[PDB]
């Protein structure tokens, strides 16, 4: 299939949330972006067959000047036989530059070098902007303060994600991302947060990295497997279960917005000796439509 790197440079502060409005996150999983893509394709009156049948995206990872970051793989690192706080430094570390990814998979990285890699990330700063609600003041009430957490990417930094699919799927992705540049991604995109510009191009470096074949597999997107594959993939695996929850965002779902069914997915960067392909899990209950949660798997091979 065709692989395209999409680089997102954000012109405005961005509100990515995990559980609350005040919480600000620097990245979004693949499920959030797939929800945005489905919403956009519905707005643009476009078919959902390509996205639901062949699109394979990853999460959004940091990038900066001359470095593209990948999730820290969940491998058994030997550390230093002297100190245990080296493992603390490794757990604090979260993202590895693409150049150092193979080295980290082969060890060869000290705890001090791990902290250096962690601090080498040049991805913006998060803040908490406090706003008010004045709608109660007209009918004999008080102003209600409330905080929104936002994230400001540094001028040459931003997010990126790889996308794999057919030529037609890649074209639909290009059109939908062009529309999404102005639709915005985030949690307050109707109040200014999340305006961005995307650039979609084929990357030789990342294509070569994906072409690399190793003994183990690494998840690049928040994914989960069905029972037939879950009985086999879990053997000798190091993963992390993320609790994907959220409210439904759509006018036609119900008279009032209600929560989705709680989902659990393998975080990006988990290590599996056996590879699995995810499914688009339906997380709606008794709804007018079916809410889609993305759990397909984008695999990066590695040597440990």
- Please tell me whether residue 256 binds other proteins under the rule CB under 8 A: yes
Question: What is d(CA 70, CA 95) in angstroms, rounded to the nearest whole number?
Answer: 5
- Please tell me whether residue 65 binds other proteins under the rule CB under 8 A: no
Cα dist. 269→140, 222, 223 in Å?
53, 9, 10
- Please tell me whether residue 137 binds other proteins under the rule CB under 8 A: yes
Long-range contacts of 86-94 (CB under 8 A, 24+ apart): 86/110, 86/111, 86/114, 87/111, 89/114, 89/115, 89/118, 90/114, 92/118, 93/117, 93/118, 94/118, 94/121
- The nearer residue to other proteins, 83 or 168, going by C-beta atoms, is 83
In the complex, least distance from residue 113 CB atom to other proteins, rounded to whole angstroms: 14
- Please tell me whether residue 94 binds other proteins under the rule CB under 8 A: no
In the complex, least distance from residue 290 CB atom to other proteins, rounded to whole angstroms: 13
Question: What is d(CA 253, CA 108) in angstroms, rounded to the nearest whole number?
Answer: 52
- Applying CB under 8 A, which of residues 3, 7, 44, 54 lies at the interface with other proteins? 44
Under rule CB under 8 A, which residues in 192-211 are in contact with other proteins?
192-193, 195
Look up residue 123 and give its two tokens: 């991805």
- Applying CB under 8 A, which of residues 53, 127, 199, 212 lies at the interface with other proteins? 127
∠ CA(191), CA(194), CA(199), 5° rounding?
145
- Please tell me whether residue 124 binds other proteins under the rule CB under 8 A: yes
DSSP structural state of residue 261: P
Q: Collapse the DSSP code of 152 into the 3-class scheme (helix H, G, I; strand E, B; otherwise coil) and give the result.
A: strand
Stretch binding other proteins (CB under 8 A), from 47-55, 60-68, 100-108, 232-240? 232-240
- Please tell me whether residue 76 binds other proteins under the rule CB under 8 A: yes
Stretch binding other proteins (CB under 8 A), from 30-38, 39-47, 65-73, 158-166? 39-47
- Please tell me whether residue 289 binds other proteins under the rule CB under 8 A: no
- Which residue shows structure tokens 């996150």? 25
In the complex, least distance from residue 183 CB atom to other proteins, rounded to whole angstroms: 8
């Amino acid at each position: 299939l065709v692989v395209k790197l999409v680089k997102l440079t954000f012109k405005s502060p961005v509100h990515f949330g995990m559980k609350r409005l005040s919480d600000s996150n620097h990245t979004i999983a693949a499920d959030t972006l797939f929800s945005a893509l489905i919403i956009e394709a519905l707005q643009q009156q476009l078919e959902l067959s390509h996205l639901l049948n062949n699109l394979v995206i990853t999460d959004l990872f940091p990038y900066n000047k001359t470095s593209y970051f990948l999730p820290k793989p969940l491998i058994r690192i030997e550390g230093k036989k002297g100190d245990e706080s080296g493992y603390k430094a490794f757990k604090k570390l979260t993202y590895i530059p693409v150049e150092n990814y193979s080295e980290y998979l082969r060890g060869e990285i000290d705890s001090l070098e791990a902290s250096k890699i962690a601090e080498s990330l040049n991805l913006g700063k998060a803040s908490l902007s406090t706003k008010v609600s004045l709608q109660a003041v007209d009918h004999n009430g008080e102003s209600e303060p409330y905080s929104v957490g936002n994230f400001t990417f540094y001028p040459e930094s931003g997010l990126y994600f790889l996308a794999k699919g057919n030529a037609d799927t890649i074209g639909q992705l290009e059109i939908l991302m062009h529309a999404l540049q102005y639709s915005g991604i985030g949690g307050k995109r109707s109040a200014g947060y999340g305006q961005f510009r995307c650039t979609i191009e084929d990357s030789g470096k990342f294509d070569s990295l994906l072409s690399q074949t190793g003994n183990i597999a690494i998840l690049l997107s928040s994914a989960m497997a069905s029972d037939e594959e879950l009985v086999d993939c879990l053997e000798d695996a190091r993963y992390l279960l993320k609790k994907r929850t959220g409210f439904v965002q759509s006018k036609t779902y119900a008279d009032q917005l209600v929560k989705k069914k709680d989902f659990y997915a393998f975080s990006a960067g988990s290590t599996f000796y056996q590879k699995f392909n995810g499914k688009i899990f339906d997380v709606s209950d008794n709804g007018r439509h079916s809410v889609y949660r993305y759990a397909k798997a984008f695999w990066l091979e590695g040597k440990i």
